[PDB]
Each structure stands twice: as structure tokens, then as C-alpha cells.
């Protein structure tokens, strides 16, 4: 998993704040995991 690697490098707020302005985008962070980094 590209989002299992984003996990372990990234803290916690800007994990939190990423998947957020993700689903504004209009899309999970499961179906991007590239775009997710």
C-alpha cells in the first residue's frame, strides 16, 4: 500500500489534515494512494 507507506513517514496532524482535503477533492485515500502522498 502506497497509504500504509504514509502512515509511518508523516505525523499525526498532517495525516489528520491530508485525508480531509481529500474528500473535499472528492475521493478516499484508499483509491489514491500516490496522490495521498
Known amino acids: 500500500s502506497m497509504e500504509n507507506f504514509v502512515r ?3 505525523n499525526p496532524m498532517i495525516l489528520e489534515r491530508a ?3 481529500m474528500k473535499e477533492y ?3 485515500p484508499q483509491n489514491e494512494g500516490n ?3
Open 8 to 10: 509511518t513517514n508523516f
Open 19 to 21: 485525508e480531509k482535503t
Open 26 to 28: 472528492g475521493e478516499n
Open 35 to 37: 496522490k495521498f502522498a
